[PDB]
Amino acid sequence: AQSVPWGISRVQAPAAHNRGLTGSGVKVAVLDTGISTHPDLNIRGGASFVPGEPSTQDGNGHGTHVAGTIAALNNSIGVLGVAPSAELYAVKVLGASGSGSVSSIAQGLEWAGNNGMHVANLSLGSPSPSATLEQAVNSATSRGVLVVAASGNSGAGSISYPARYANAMAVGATDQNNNRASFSQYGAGLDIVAPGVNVQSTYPGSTYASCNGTSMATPHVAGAAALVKQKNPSWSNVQIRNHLKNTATSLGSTNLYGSGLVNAEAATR
Numbered sequence: 138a139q140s141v142p143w144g145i146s147r148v149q150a151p152a153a154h155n156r157g158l159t160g161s162g163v164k165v166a167v168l169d170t171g172i173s174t175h176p177d178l179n180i181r182g183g184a185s186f187v188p189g190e191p192s193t194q195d196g197n198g199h200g201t202h203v204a205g206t207i208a209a210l211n212n213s214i215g216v217l218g219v220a221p222s223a224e225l226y227a228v229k230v231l232g233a234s235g236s237g238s239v240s241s242i243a244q245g246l247e248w249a250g251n252n253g254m255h256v257a258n259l260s261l262g263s264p265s266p267s268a269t270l271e272q273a274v275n276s277a278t279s280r281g282v283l284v285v286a287a288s289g290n291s292g293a294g295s296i297s298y299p300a301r302y303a304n305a306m307a308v309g310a311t312d313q314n315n316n317r318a319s320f321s322q323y324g325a326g327l328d329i330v331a332p333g334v335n336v337q338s339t340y341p342g343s344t345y346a347s348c349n350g351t352s353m354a355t356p357h358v359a360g361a362a363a364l365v366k367q368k369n370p371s372w373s374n375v376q377i378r379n380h381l382k383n384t385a386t387s388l389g390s391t392n393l394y395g396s397g398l399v400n401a402e403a404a405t406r
């Protein structure tokens with residue numbers, strides 16, 4: 138039996154699916170700890186930039202979980218992603234510990250731009266800026282990648298890098314009441330929010346687990362971007378980003394929520 142995690146319903150992905158929009162034909166890179174083989178995922182390819190971890194399999198769990206929020210398969214098992222037909226790529230930039238370097242993340246972004254990705258999900262960040270990272274965000278953006286990044290989990294009224302950069306779409310986390318999760322960073326540069334509390338997704342060992350974080354919010358938006366791209370194949374990264382913001386549901390101040398809650402139904406109407 139398949140179940141639909143509450144956040145998938147909250148962002149109204151099923152309404153898009155009913156219109157025939159699944160993310161088919163859209164390439165989404167998950168720049169994370171890898172993605173493990175799983176019966177509810179279809180991993181099309183990828184690359185590793187973590188020395189000593191040449192495989193793109195996930196030794197942590199984080200990247201597998203993120204991937205399932207984007208693209209868990211629509212079938213009779215497991216869960217269901219926002220964009221269940223997205224072409225999913227495992228871009229390992231963080232090791233099994235859950236950390237990497239700005240160099241590995243940059244290499245993943247360059248890979249995305251050189252390999253035709255439409256969306257890059259970066260459920261990662263730091264409080265400090267990085268020239269290396271910024272350059273790679275900008276390069277990927279120039280190559281047509283929509284970079285979607287987590288605002289961070291410190292609870293502060295400023296957001297992490299690379300989410301803070303103008304060419305990243307920064308995503309904060311909401312709870313089931315449509316309030317900002319306590320940990321969700323906010324402030325200047327925040328673009329949008331999505332569900333990030335008690336988010337069930339795919340997990341290594343062919344299982345499912347629930348997690349909290351802006352890392353869980355981010356893939357809802359990456360998936361919504363893929364739905365928008367399938368509907369509007371001619372659109373650029375900027376056009377998709379703007380449309381997601383313009384069609385989001387206001388939840389309160391732009392400072393706490395950016396444009397508000399992503400709405401895949403409104404974005405694909």
Ligand SMILES: *Cc1ccc(-c2ccc(C)cn2)nc1
Nearest residue numbers: 198199202340346347348349
């Ligand atoms: C052994 C093991 C199994 C599951 C997990 C886990 C589940 C959920 C989240 C959010 C993080 N980690 N860790 C270790």
Ligand SMILES: [Ca+2]
Nearest residue numbers: 210214215216
């Ligand atoms: Ca499924």
Ligand SMILES: [Cl-]
Nearest residue numbers: 190191192193
């Ligand atoms: Cl490996």
